[PDB]
């Protein structure tokens, strides 16, 4: 029908021919796989600089392609533009799937925050700019939430900085970002994403501190159970702490929506001289 036809459209759009892609050096290589730089040859002739994320059976490949087809369809300046996917096969007969992304020379936001505290890195980031990062993330999440898409892994390390210093949310799905009900019931809503956004906001206000200093990951559920939350960063506005705090209300339904948060953030940013 319209649902199957709509899905089949998206599947055609999302796959890239392997010969239009040249893989380069490894930029990072964890347990999940590898991020590598690459060139993508475009419709208009010219090559584009890309990042290539390499991620085990035929069932999982379809699921991957279907999911990738949904993400390719996103279109917002504060949401990373998925350019397409390639599937290579290994010699051992294991299919290696590859996610093609625009190359982001300024990297992730977490590293950028930490670097800003080092002489050779980017100049001290003023609050006006820090707040603007939060607005950008809110905007991207607002978009995603409107389309009922759940990120499942919102954190400063998964927000990327474009060449114009615009922040986009990326790396779609770390105990300290997980909302209380998701630790408990293993259930995840947009209000769970809002919780993570609160934590992400706190990362930016602290210029990259790890959440909950003094609290081990295994201590996290009981810590939150007894009503403790992230503490107000020094020299952080009370109104800004009020906003981020509202993201961690015990009852998911008491937490604001991304659209409400985004608007609260913009007003606060306007008020700054
Ligand atoms: C968006 C995205 C989607 C998927 C994914 C998943 C989990 N399931 N399906 C089906 C897909 C698809 N398609 C996987 C990874 C990403 C992603 N987003 N950001 C990145 N990075 C590796 C960060 C990055 C980006 C750009 C960049 N340039 C230099 C360095 N850089 C670093 O990875
Ligand atoms: Cl992008
Ligand atoms: Cl860019
Ligand atoms: Cl730190
Ligand atoms: Cl804390």
Describe this structure in words.
- It comes from Homo sapiens.
- ATP binds at residues 27-35, 49.
- Residues 21-269 form the Protein kinase domain.
- Belongs to the protein kinase superfamily. Tyr protein kinase family. AXL/UFO subfamily.
- This is Tyrosine-protein kinase Mer.
- This protein has 273 residues and is α+β, with helices and mostly antiparallel strands.
- It folds into 2 domains: 2-102, Phosphorylase Kinase, domain 1 (2-Layer Sandwich), CATH 3.30.200.20; 107-271, Transferase(Phosphotransferase) domain 1 (Transferase(Phosphotransferase), domain 1, Orthogonal Bundle).
- Helices cover 38% and strands 16% of the residues.
- It contains 9 helices and 7 strands.
- The chain has helices at 2-14, 58-72, 109-115, 127-146, 180-184, 190-205, 220-225, 238-246, 258-271; strands at 21-29, 34-41, 47-54, 84-89, 95-102, 159-161, 167-169.
- The strands form 2 sheets. A 5-stranded antiparallel β-sheet has the order 1-2-3-5-4, covered by helices on one side. Strands 6-7 form a two-stranded antiparallel ribbon.
- The longest helix has 20 residues, at 127-146.
- It is globular, with a radius of gyration of 20 Å.
- The structure holds the ligand Cc1cc(-c2c(C)nn(C)c2C#N)ccc1-c1nnc(N(C)Cc2ccc3nccn3c2)o1 and chloride ion (4 copies).
- The site of one chloride ion (CL) has 4 residues, from loops.
- The site of ligand VK2 has 20 residues, from strand 3, helix 2 and strand 5.
């Amino acid at each position: 029908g319209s649902h199957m036809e709509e899905l089949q459209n998206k599947l055609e759009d999302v796959v890239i021919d392997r010969n239009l892609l040249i893989l380069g050096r490894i930029l990072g290589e964890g347990e999940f796989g590898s991020v590598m730089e690459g060139n993508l040859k475009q419709e208009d002739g010219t090559s584009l600089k890309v990042a290539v994320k390499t991620m085990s059976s035929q069932r999982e490949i379809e699921e991957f392609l279907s999911e990738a087809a949904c993400m390719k369809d996103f279109s917002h300046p504060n949401v990373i533009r998925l350019l397409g996917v390639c599937i290579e096969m290994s010699s051992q007969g294991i299919p290696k799937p590859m996610v093609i992304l625009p190359f982001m020379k300024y990297g992730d936001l977490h590293t950028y925050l930490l670097y800003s505290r080092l002489e050779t890195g980017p100049r001290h980031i003023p609050l006006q700019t820090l707040l603007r990062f939060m607005v950008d993330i809110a905007l991207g999440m607002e978009y995603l939430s409107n389309r009922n898409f759940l990120h499942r892994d919102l954190a400063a390390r998964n927000c990327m900085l474009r060449d114009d210093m615009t922040v986009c949310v990326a790396d779609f799905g770390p105990v300290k970002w997980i909302a209380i009900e998701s630790l408990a019931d293993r259930v995840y809503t947009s209000k769970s994403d809002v919780w993570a956004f609160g934590v992400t906001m706190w990362e930016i206000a602290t210029r990259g501190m790890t959440p909950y200093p003094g609290v081990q990951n295994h201590e996290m559920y009981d810590y939150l159970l007894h009503g403790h939350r992230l503490k107000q960063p020094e020299d952080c506005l009370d109104e800004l702490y009020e906003i981020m705090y509202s993201c961690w209300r015990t009852d998911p339904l008491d937490r604001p929506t991304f659209s409400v948060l985004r608007l609260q953030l913009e007003r606060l940013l306007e008020s700054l001289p």
